[PDB]
Amino acid sequence: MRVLVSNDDGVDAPGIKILADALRNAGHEVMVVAPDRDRSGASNSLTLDTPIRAKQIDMHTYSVAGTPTDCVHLALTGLLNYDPDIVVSGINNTGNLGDDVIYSGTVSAAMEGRFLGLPAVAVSLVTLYRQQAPQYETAAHAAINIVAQLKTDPLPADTILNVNVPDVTWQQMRGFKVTRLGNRHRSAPCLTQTDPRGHTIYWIGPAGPEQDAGPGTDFDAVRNTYISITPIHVDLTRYQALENVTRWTDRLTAHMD
């Protein structure tokens, strides 16, 4: 099939190079459009006030000076003469779990893919301890299997998949599981120290034992050497609360003017 590939670490990242090579060996056609450098640390929204620069690296690669949402949007609206069937973002050098997903760069690229009517998948690697080469080939192998399964057995396509792969060899993996998002921000206290000049500074400390990381969550599966799969929303409207708020607003109207 015809696949598009993007990320948020940059076009020169080793994670995006291995992912692309694995797909071509499977018999797919792959185009790549990625940022010129690491974009993590800035806003994810679209640029509308200024024009955007772009240059070509090779016959299959384009470099873009902007956000990862700009990359996917332009590629499907006239930048190229190419009609893909699916969008894949990755592979990230750091995991994306729990309540950190909403502001993730890797996820943002897949989000823009579904807005235009295409199923999308996000893939991350769970590394630890910041000369050991990461197991990128392991994450790539899991990607080519999910894609081939979506081809024959499609999904309702009103959802995107978030995937996290443990940093080990394939022979040590234990299997696949479907999980939910957990929480961690609640159990993070603050700290107080002094700089070399004697001014008070503040740190955000580590997580405590009272965190939501029990059985059923994505945090629990990755610690037991399992691959996590979590379906997430695409529309932030809570429809199951509309009828109640409407009656709540009716009372507010009569109490005022």
188 is an interface residue for its own copies by CB under 8 A: yes
Bridge partners, residue 2, by sequence:
29
* Two structure tokens written together for 142: 């899991």
Parallel, antiparallel, or unpaired for β 200-204 and 190-194?
A: antiparallel
Q: Is 25 annotated as a binding residue?
A: no
Token readout for 144 is 């080519």
Instruction: Provide, rounded to whole angstroms, the least separation between the CB of residue 166 and Mn ion.
Output: 18
* 82 makes contact with its own copies (CB under 8 A): no
Find out whether 83 is annotated in a ligand binding site: no
Residue 129 found at the interface with its own copies (CB under 8 A): no
Question: Applying CB under 5 A, which part among 6-14, 166-174, 199-207, 208-216 lies near Mn ion?
Answer: 6-14
Does residue 41 belong to the site contacting its own copies (CB under 8 A)?
A: yes
CA angle 3, 170, 124 (to 5 degrees): 50
Q: Which listed range, 9-17, 27-35, 71-79, 87-95, lies at the site for its own copies (CB under 8 A)?
A: 71-79
Write the CB contacts of 98 (distance below 8 Å, at least 6 apart in sequence): 181, 182, 183, 184, 217, 218, 219
Please, which residues have CB within 8 angstroms of residue 37's CB and are 6 or more apart in sequence?
A: 10
String of contacts with Mn ion for each residue 40-59, x by CB under 5 A? x-------------------
CA distance 34 to 68: 7
Site for its own copies in 202-241 (CB under 8 A): 202-205, 229-233, 235-239, 241
- Binding-site residue numbers are 8-9, 40, 92
Residues of this chain that interact with Mn ion (CB under 5 A) are: 8-9, 40, 92
